[PDB]
Amino acid sequence: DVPLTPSQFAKAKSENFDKKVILSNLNKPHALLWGPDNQIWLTERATGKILRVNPESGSVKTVFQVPEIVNDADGQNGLLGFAFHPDFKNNPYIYISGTFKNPKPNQTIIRRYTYNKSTDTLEKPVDLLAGLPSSKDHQSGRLVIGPDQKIYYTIGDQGRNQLAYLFLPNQAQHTPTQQELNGKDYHTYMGKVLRLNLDGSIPKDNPSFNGVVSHIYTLGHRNPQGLAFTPNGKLLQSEQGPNSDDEINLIVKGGNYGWPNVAGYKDDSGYAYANYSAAANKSIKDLAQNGVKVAAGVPVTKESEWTGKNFVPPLKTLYTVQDTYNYNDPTCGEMTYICWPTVAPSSAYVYKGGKKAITGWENTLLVPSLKRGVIFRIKLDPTYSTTYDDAVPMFKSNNRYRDVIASPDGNVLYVLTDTAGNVQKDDGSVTNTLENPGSLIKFT
Amino acid sequence: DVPLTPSQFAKAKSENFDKKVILSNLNKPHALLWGPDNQIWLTERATGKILRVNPESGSVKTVFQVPEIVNDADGQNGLLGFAFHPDFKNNPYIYISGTFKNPKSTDKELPNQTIIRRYTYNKSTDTLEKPVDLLAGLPSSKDHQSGRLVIGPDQKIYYTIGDQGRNQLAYLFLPNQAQHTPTQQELNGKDYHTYMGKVLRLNLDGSIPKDNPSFNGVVSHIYTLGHRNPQGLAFTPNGKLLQSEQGPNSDDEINLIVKGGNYGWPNVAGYKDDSGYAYANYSAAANKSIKDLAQNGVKVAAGVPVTKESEWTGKNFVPPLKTLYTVQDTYNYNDPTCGEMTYICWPTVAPSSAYVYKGGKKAITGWENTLLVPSLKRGVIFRIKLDPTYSTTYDDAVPMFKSNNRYRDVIASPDGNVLYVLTDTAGNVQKDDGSVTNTLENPGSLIKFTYK
Numbered sequence: 043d044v045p046l047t048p049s050q051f052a053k054a055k056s057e058n059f060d061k062k063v064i065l066s067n068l069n070k071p072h073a074l075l076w077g078p079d080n081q082i083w084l085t086e087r088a089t090g091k092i093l094r095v096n097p098e099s100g101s102v103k104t105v106f107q108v109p110e111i112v113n114d115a116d117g118q119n120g121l122l123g124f125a126f127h128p129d130f131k132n133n134p135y136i137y138i139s140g141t142f143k144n145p146k147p148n149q150t151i152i153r154r155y156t157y158n159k160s161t162d163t164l165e166k167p168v169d170l171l172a173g174l175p176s177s178k179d180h181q182s183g184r185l186v187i188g189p190d191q192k193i194y195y196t197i198g199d200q201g202r203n204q205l206a207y208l209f210l211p212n213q214a215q216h217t218p219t220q221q222e223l224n225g226k227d228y229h230t231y232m233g234k235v236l237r238l239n240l241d242g243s244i245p246k247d248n249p250s251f252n253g254v255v256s257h258i259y260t261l262g263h264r265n266p267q268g269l270a271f272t273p274n275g276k277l278l279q280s281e282q283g284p285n286s287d288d289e290i291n292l293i294v295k296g297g298n299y300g301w302p303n304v305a306g307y308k309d310d311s312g313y314a315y316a317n318y319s320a321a322a323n324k325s326i327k328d329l330a331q332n333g334v335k336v337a338a339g340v341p342v343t344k345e346s347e348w349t350g351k352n353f354v355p356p357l358k359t360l361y362t363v364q365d366t367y368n369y370n371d372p373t374c375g376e377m378t379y380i381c382w383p384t385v386a387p388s389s390a391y392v393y394k395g396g397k398k399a400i401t402g403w404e405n406t407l408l409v410p411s412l413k414r415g416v417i418f419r420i421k422l423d424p425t426y427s428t429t430y431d432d433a434v435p436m437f438k439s440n441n442r443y444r445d446v447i448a449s450p451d452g453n454v455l456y457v458l459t460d461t462a463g464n465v466q467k468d469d470g471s472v473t474n475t476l477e478n479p480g481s482l483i484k485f486t
Numbered sequence: 487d488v489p490l491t492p493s494q495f496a497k498a499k500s501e502n503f504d505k506k507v508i509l510s511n512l513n514k515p516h517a518l519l520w521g522p523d524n525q526i527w528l529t530e531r532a533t534g535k536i537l538r539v540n541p542e543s544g545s546v547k548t549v550f551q552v553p554e555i556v557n558d559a560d561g562q563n564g565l566l567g568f569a570f571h572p573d574f575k576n577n578p579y580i581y582i583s584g585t586f587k588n589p590k591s592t593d594k595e596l597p598n599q600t601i602i603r604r605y606t607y608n609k610s611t612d613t614l615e616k617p618v619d620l621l622a623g624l625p626s627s628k629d630h631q632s633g634r635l636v637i638g639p640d641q642k643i644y645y646t647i648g649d650q651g652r653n654q655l656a657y658l659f660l661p662n663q664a665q666h667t668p669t670q671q672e673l674n675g676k677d678y679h680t681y682m683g684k685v686l687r688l689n690l691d692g693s694i695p696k697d698n699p700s701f702n703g704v705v706s707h708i709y710t711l712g713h714r715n716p717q718g719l720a721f722t723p724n725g726k727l728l729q730s731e732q733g734p735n736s737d738d739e740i741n742l743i744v745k746g747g748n749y750g751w752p753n754v755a756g757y758k759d760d761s762g763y764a765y766a767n768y769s770a771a772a773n774k775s776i777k778d779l780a781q782n783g784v785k786v787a788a789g790v791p792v793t794k795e796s797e798w799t800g801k802n803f804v805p806p807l808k809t810l811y812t813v814q815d816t817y818n819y820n821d822p823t824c825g826e827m828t829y830i831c832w833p834t835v836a837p838s839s840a841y842v843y844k845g846g847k848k849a850i851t852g853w854e855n856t857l858l859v860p861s862l863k864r865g866v867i868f869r870i871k872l873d874p875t876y877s878t879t880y881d882d883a884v885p886m887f888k889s890n891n892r893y894r895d896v897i898a899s900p901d902g903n904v905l906y907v908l909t910d911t912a913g914n915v916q917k918d919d920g921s922v923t924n925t926l927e928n929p930g931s932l933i934k935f936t937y938k
């Protein structure tokens with residue numbers, strides 16, 4: 043898609059909705075879910091707390107706090123995954139993923155907790171899968187259980203080939219060896235959508251890569267923070283691209299999603315793969331022009347020059363631009379990245395409507411934007427095969443939307459907001475003064 | 487997708503297949519189908535003939551010649567639609583569409599109508615009898631007629647009807663109707679002028695299906711709108727409707743036909759990316775003596791209104807699964823390696839058809855869930871892979887059977903180890919070096935390609 047202008051975003055205030063803050067003092071609220079008790083359960087990434095807010099009153103109780111969660115003030119790590127069991131009534135289990143120190147600097151662990159209604163807390167912990175990659179960047183961590191009862195988990199590319207991890211060789215394309223996988227060497231589990239049994243083991247019907255079946259379901263992802271199933275069993279996803287091509291992808295078994303060789307469509311438009319991990323002298327500066335304009339010494343590969351297999355394109359990109367696009371926009375003062383042709387999707391929620399269904403939102407995908415302070419409504423067709431028209435921005439505000447769910451009746455939306463950060467105001471300029479820090483707000 | 491280079495096309499020779507010309511010098515062979523009698527049936531667009539060929543022996547027989555078929559030697563009109571009834575044994579019906587004089591016209595060009603008609607096949611007499619007009623009075627012209635006709639899993643006739651070439655070449659100043667929809671009043675008087683650049687869905691008796699999508703309040707024969715020249719149309723085993731379509735100077739498409747979907751033509755070619763194309767409305771040109779620069783709307787003569795794809799106020803837009811090809815605004819549409827024929831070097835392939843490879847007891851390795859797209863101007867058969875559910879494409883369109891021929895249509899034998907293709911009798915094609923020729927290796931031919 044084509045970038046919306048600062049003007050277009052500013053006029054997307056969603057006047058037709060009543061805004062109402064439920065919670066205010068929250069420490070990096072990450073994910074929120076509609077609990078099996080008709081209560082909203084959210085998480086705090088830094089602290090590892092699992093709250094339970096009464097959606098009708100706003101009363102909150104700290105159910106449990108995941109112990110030893112590591113969190114870098116400058117990072118995206120901490121308590122990440124968070125899901126319930128499909129049949130909670132009969133199987134009261136909660137699934138999470140978090141950043142924990144690795145005695146042999148950190149690892150990522152997918153852990154199952156056992157819910158005790160009597161004491162109303164989490165007990166009997168079992169590690170489903172550990173030794174997973176960890177860094178301060180692009181951890182992703184969306185954890186959902188599918189219609190097949192499998193754990194679907196997104197694990198980012200750890201931020202390799204950019205910023206702090208500029209010269210680390212991106213492994214979104216890398217797959218494990220039978221020998222490594224046999225030694226629980228999950229170093230390849232970067233930029234992947236994992237699919238695992240409820241005991242952390244490898245599903246026997248998982249896709250094969252290099253003659254090897256592992257926990258990998260799909261590959262070639264950057265920072266896929268959005269992951270949600272549709273009423274008909276399809277897997278929609280939202281992902282963060284580089285200076286461009288944030289995506290809405292349809293996850294399919296064994297599908298290769300191109301990162302880092304391809305950002306968005308394979309069109310050689312506005313992005314080229316500049317591999318800094320192969321640069322001669324590692325002193326070379328990343329010009330931050332999305333690979334379109336690079337410093338001498340860095341091997342650049344056109345997406346069209348990629349010799350990949352099973353490449354699956356996005357259903358939509360926010361946004362795709364041409365090579366003439368200016369990645370240094372003066373409108374964003376110093377924070378030049380906020381003026382990049384992206385929206386920074388923090389999640390992906392599939393709106394199931396209800397007896398109070400918002401009119402015209404049938405088969406829509408809600409995608410919250412961090413940097414743009416909007417929540418996108420992406421309409422798809424009844425079969426969830428394609429998108430109709432564009433991504434319509436909603437609830438414009440000086441806030442960084444982190445997640446979003448809807449009530450059963452489906453007339454009220456609950457969104458989480460970043461405790462702090464940079465967001466684009468009504469003009470093209472930027473600010474770090476967030477209107478609603480670490481909050482759970484409700485739109486009716 | 488990004489355009490292949492002449493050299494990449496050139497090496498797509500396909501040595502892994504045996505090339506064997508069955509027939510030659512057919513009169514503008516258009517569509518071929520695999521008959522129930524395990525014999526190959528093909529159509530001759532100009533003459534209106536229906537030929538039955540013996541796959542192994544090559545014996546031809548003119549089974550039937552559709553009477554009054556109108557065809558301009560220079561146009562894309564004539565006998566178009568050609569389909570058998572799914573259960574041909576119980577229901578021996580052949581469905582066609584063709585250009586016929588319209589006694590009820592009021593124009594120069596626009597003197598013809600397109601008619602979807604049913605024929606009954608007589609076993610012992612071996613010819614088509616008892617003709618039944620199902621839907622007549624359909625738009626007609628020399629350009630973009632499309633005319634693919636398939637019978638859907640729902641027992642409905644699905645038909646592609648091009649935008650009639652409006653807004654280009656000989657119809658440059660005619661207002662494109664791809665996005666237009668019929669009023670009830672028009673539907674009552676059987677006025678189907680708006681049936682342009684559409685995928686029609688109609689009952690077998692030719693009436694409007696009660697469960698057809700609505701467009702601006704009216705349920706008509708329209709299933710999907712906003713098409714240019716959709717020559718490819720084929721159902722996948724799981725009921726999905728795949729389609730191939732010709733774009734302007736760029737953005738040929740592989741589309742997934744979705745009920746009520748707006749495929750955007752002419753305001754959008756390929757993705758809504760505002761890249762390489764722009765909608766220049768020549769019918770609204772200030773001074774109409776102006777010329778069409780043929781630079782895909784990026785650069786147009788003075789006086790012609792131009793609307794960006796992003797400025798398009800349309801709804802239900804469905805983007806293509808793949809574009810052949812998409813390029814940026816800096817693209818040079820005046821490519822000197824094609825010289826006098828500046829159109830063949832454009833980032834397009836002129837997809838001539840769309841065939842779903844169903845495999846079989848001798849299926850080709852790795853061809854599961856593929857879509858064979860014959861290219862006219864590139865002399866290749868693109869093999870496009872999709873996932874098992876036919877939801878997405880895998881990788882790019884791979885060129886096959888490179889040759890100085892205009893591939894028109896393609897099918898596979900039931901066992902799946904041989905491909906049968908039709909080539910144009912005359913026309914332009916890109917040579918291995920990127921330049922143009924009209925010297926076709928196998929003019930109006932029926933070629934069989936057998937696998938390893």
Ligand SMILES: O=C(O)c1cc(C(=O)O)c2c(n1)C(=O)C(=O)c1cc(C(=O)O)[nH]c1-2
Nearest residue numbers: 118265282283284379380382384386412413
């Ligand atoms: O393209 C951008 O301008 C931009 C902005 C932001 C942002 O504002 O937080 C992120 C990203 N990109 C991004 O790629 C990304 O993976 C990301 C993660 C986060 C986050 O807060 O967890 N922000 C962002």
Ligand SMILES: O=C(O)c1cc(C(=O)O)c2c(n1)C(=O)C(=O)c1cc(C(=O)O)[nH]c1-2
Nearest residue numbers: 562715732733734829830832834836862863
């Ligand atoms: O862009 C092109 O270079 C190009 C080439 C050709 C061709 O080679 O026939 C056609 C077209 N475009 C085209 O747009 C088109 O609708 C078309 C129809 C036909 C045909 O033979 O029926 N060719 C072509």
Ligand SMILES: [Ca+2]
Nearest residue numbers: 283284285384
């Ligand atoms: Ca980004």
Ligand SMILES: [Ca+2]
Nearest residue numbers: 299300301306
């Ligand atoms: Ca991708």
Ligand SMILES: [Ca+2]
Nearest residue numbers: 305306307309
């Ligand atoms: Ca791209």
Ligand SMILES: [Ca+2]
Nearest residue numbers: 733734735834
């Ligand atoms: Ca064309």
Ligand SMILES: [Ca+2]
Nearest residue numbers: 749750751756
């Ligand atoms: Ca289209």
Ligand SMILES: [Ca+2]
Nearest residue numbers: 755756757759
């Ligand atoms: Ca376009």
